Write an enzyme that holds these catalytic residues in place. Sequence first.
Site, PDB file in Angstrom:
ATOM      1  N   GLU A  25     -19.121 -28.572  38.592  1.00  0.00           N
ATOM      2  CA  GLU A  25     -18.184 -29.432  37.877  1.00  0.00           C
ATOM      3  C   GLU A  25     -18.922 -30.486  37.066  1.00  0.00           C
ATOM      4  O   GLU A  25     -18.515 -30.822  35.948  1.00  0.00           O
ATOM      5  CB  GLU A  25     -17.219 -30.089  38.863  1.00  0.00           C
ATOM      6  CG  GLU A  25     -15.899 -30.503  38.247  1.00  0.00           C
ATOM      7  CD  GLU A  25     -14.781 -29.540  38.580  1.00  0.00           C
ATOM      8  OE1 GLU A  25     -13.671 -29.699  38.031  1.00  0.00           O
ATOM      9  OE2 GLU A  25     -15.012 -28.620  39.392  1.00  0.00           O
ATOM     10  N   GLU A  62     -12.296 -36.982  47.889  1.00  0.00           N
ATOM     11  CA  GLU A  62     -11.105 -36.526  47.184  1.00  0.00           C
ATOM     12  C   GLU A  62     -11.093 -35.009  47.064  1.00  0.00           C
ATOM     13  O   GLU A  62     -10.040 -34.377  47.202  1.00  0.00           O
ATOM     14  CB  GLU A  62     -11.031 -37.190  45.810  1.00  0.00           C
ATOM     15  CG  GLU A  62      -9.916 -36.682  44.927  1.00  0.00           C
ATOM     16  CD  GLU A  62     -10.372 -35.569  44.013  1.00  0.00           C
ATOM     17  OE1 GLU A  62     -11.021 -35.868  42.991  1.00  0.00           O
ATOM     18  OE2 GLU A  62     -10.085 -34.394  44.316  1.00  0.00           O
ATOM     19  N   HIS A  63     -12.256 -34.411  46.806  1.00  0.00           N
ATOM     20  CA  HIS A  63     -12.364 -32.956  46.807  1.00  0.00           C
ATOM     21  C   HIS A  63     -11.971 -32.383  48.160  1.00  0.00           C
ATOM     22  O   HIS A  63     -11.183 -31.434  48.245  1.00  0.00           O
ATOM     23  CB  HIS A  63     -13.792 -32.548  46.461  1.00  0.00           C
ATOM     24  CG  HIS A  63     -13.983 -32.150  45.034  1.00  0.00           C
ATOM     25  ND1 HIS A  63     -13.796 -30.859  44.591  1.00  0.00           N
ATOM     26  CD2 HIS A  63     -14.353 -32.870  43.950  1.00  0.00           C
ATOM     27  CE1 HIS A  63     -14.042 -30.801  43.296  1.00  0.00           C
ATOM     28  NE2 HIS A  63     -14.383 -32.008  42.882  1.00  0.00           N
TER      29      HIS A  63
END
Lengths: 440, 53
Positions: free
Chosen positions: A136, A59-60
């Site tokens: 993150e 997804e990143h």
Amino acid sequence: ATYAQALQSVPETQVSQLDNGLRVASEQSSQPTCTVGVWIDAGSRYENEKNNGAGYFVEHLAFKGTKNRPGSALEKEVESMGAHLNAYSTREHTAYYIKALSKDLPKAVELLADIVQNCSLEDSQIEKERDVILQELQENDSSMRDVVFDYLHATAFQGTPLAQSVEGPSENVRKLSRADLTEYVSQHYKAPRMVLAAAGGVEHRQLLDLAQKHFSSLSGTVPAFTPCRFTGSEIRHRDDALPLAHVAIAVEGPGWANPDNVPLQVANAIIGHYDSTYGGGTHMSSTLASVAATRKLCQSFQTFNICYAETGLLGAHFVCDNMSIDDMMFFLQGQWMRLCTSATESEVVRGKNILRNALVSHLDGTTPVCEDIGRSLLTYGRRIPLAEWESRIAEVDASVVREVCSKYFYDQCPAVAGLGPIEQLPDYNRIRSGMFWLRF
Amino acid sequence: TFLRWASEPEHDHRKRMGLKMLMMMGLLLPLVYAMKRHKWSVLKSRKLAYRPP
């Protein structure tokens, strides 16, 4: 327009199905904007121990360059026409939706076709993204809400894929290579597991033509998950340096199916939510919230309804100081068993109205409508019309709420996750004893 | 034996209560022990892990 007529006047969600298995669906409106996005059935629930975190990684990488669109060129498109490209990956769903103008749907769908099919997975880009994901993860470590919810998931579904977090362990993050990412996208981003939702001013036939012109060369016509097991446990990450103590207590709830969700939500609507910066304070109908405002027991509390495909978590999460965890556990369990044993009719009516407001007001704006479309065609298998929701809420009464709460709350082993100065937090035996009433 | 009875009139009745007590204790000790183990199993399963920074 007496409400019910307004509910009937809501336009319906037309649903189609491509030959590849793509469930193209659209809801037509008159707004000059739109939100179009694909929802895929990938997530951490379908991730093994070694693959854990591959969904977040892909997804990143999705937005950072494709094959046809090299790198920022893709982004160069999205900003050029004012589109807002966004994504989110839940434990069982993934989605990439592009807010755009109604006249930019032909291009936007194209971009989506590039994102999910012709991805890049550039090795150097993978290396740049690995440290970003690590930082993150470090940022999320300070998120005392997300950390507590992940603790609850781990301690409730221990030994099952549902216990896995979305981002995955840092070990997997550093270990993951390009081969794992491409294998994951090739195995999970299959056409039958994708739904191309599009809300706003998009005509369904135009959406169908666009999908057939772009999403045609997808997979033809397999991880189907395993029924996870609930295990009433507790995790106590005692850390007295933390200012507040986040606690989350849940029970095995229903799934996306099992209509008992509708009454159960009503029960949660009865308990409600509260925090320090609220309005009426010691006047709100929720006895829990009224007591909390009266004695300032906490700074926040909520009732969640996290429900997965076959199981789900139903319970509460409260943020309070170190000296008031026992009192709020007492009051929360007292409210739960008050609903369980004698729910009354007036509170049920209030819960029905609150649930009506939640469903109605939540579905405003193109983004929530499109998200509802994509999530409903995956979970329920059908976009449940608001009229059906109204009827299901109407069928709920005091006896139904009492019965369903007895089924899911009374004499059940809960899963507890506390983080912070949680020394006061009663031992699991005391909590389990609070899960049953001697008077009743 | 008559003098023994004269000293202890409750002898046979004492043994009757003794037999009933033996059966009741043999039924109760295991069950109360089971309840104690059931309530204490929460503690006697902990997996405390230390994770300093």
